[PDB]
């Protein structure tokens, strides 16, 4: 079935008849909504950009993706959050070239 039926190897365990589960509503926590997107775009218009966000955009403008990634990781702290930050800055530039 979904288990190998023996006590060792890949996908080990006892076979059972899987029952379909309706996903919990709490699992939808990270989902975005129309309300939060609309509000977040308005606040971005009002707030502007942080000093480090402005500096990042210039590095991306100067073809310094490797430079921009290191600054973002120094600022934000982790590599995963830096990768997302550098991207939304690339989208910001892409939406200001027109």
């Amino acid at each position: 079935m979904a288990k190998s039926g023996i006590a060792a190897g890949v996908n080990k365990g006892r076979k059972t008849t899987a029952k379909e589960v309706a996903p919990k509503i709490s699992y939808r926590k990270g989902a975005s909504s129309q309300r939060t997107v609309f509000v977040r775009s308005i606040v971005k218009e009002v707030a502007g950009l942080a000093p480090y966000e402005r500096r990042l955009i210039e590095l991306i403008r100067n073809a310094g993706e490797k430079r921009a990634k290191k600054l973002a990781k120094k600022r934000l702290g982790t590599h995963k959050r830096a990768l997302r930050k550098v991207e939304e800055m690339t989208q910001v530039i892409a939406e200001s070239r027109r």
Binding site: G9, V10, K12, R14, T17, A18, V21
Partner: protein
């Protein structure tokens, strides 16, 4: 300080342990008063049973997979199957657990049958119910009336079917496959791009 052929001991008594010695002289008194509390609680709510009905669940881990024990509450799906709202179910002696889900069908079916057995014996009083009818009932023990029972282990006689490959060989092959799955996948993949890029 170290003499003769003796085991080396770990006696953790270098703190002020004599200030934290708890002697259970009150074990018998606690037993008696626990029984008195139990009696008072039972007599307050009679003939309604003192225990809520509990489900039956599989014990977690590889060591306790075999055993089956009493759970905390019937899942919302199990109560859905017997048509009892959880808010209502809490009021008629059926325990509810919003946290548990049913990935399998065996536990779900066992708990559904348990709920049906309970619901069959349930008699719900009302305003029209009089003192004589209520008096004709006895306070049962729900846990003993619906005990958690281990499924019967396999016994008896069966036909013998001998596969060609031994069980030991099967286990050895499963171990080897699991051990080298990643390296074989990496090798096969890189060979795939090697033979799909230079053959373009």
């Amino acid at each position: 300080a170290i003499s003769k052929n003796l085991p080396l001991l770990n006696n953790h008594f270098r703190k002020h342990w004599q200030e934290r010695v708890r002697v259970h002289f009150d074990q018998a008194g606690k037993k008696a008063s626990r029984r008195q509390s139990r009696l008072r609680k039972a007599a307050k709510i009679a003939p309604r049973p003192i225990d809520a009905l509990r489900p039956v669940v599989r014990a977690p881990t590889v060591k306790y997979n075999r055993k089956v024990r009493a759970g905390r509450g019937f899942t919302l799906a199990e109560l859905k199957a017997v048509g009892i709202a959880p808010k209502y179910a809490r009021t008629i002696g059926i325990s509810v657990d919003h946290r548990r889900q049913n990935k399998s069908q065996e536990t779900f079916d066992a708990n559904v049958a348990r709920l049906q057995e309970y619901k069959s014996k349930l008699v719900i009083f009302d305003k029209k119910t009089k003192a004589s009818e209520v008096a004709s009932f006895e306070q049962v023990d729900v846990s003993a009336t619906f005990p958690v029972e281990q499924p019967a282990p396999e016994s008896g006689l069966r036909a013998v079917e001998v596969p060609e490959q031994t069980a030991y060989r099967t286990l050895r092959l499963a171990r080897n496959e699991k051990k080298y799955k990643g390296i074989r996948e990496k090798r096969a993949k890189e060979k795939a791009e090697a033979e799909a890029e230079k053959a373009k």
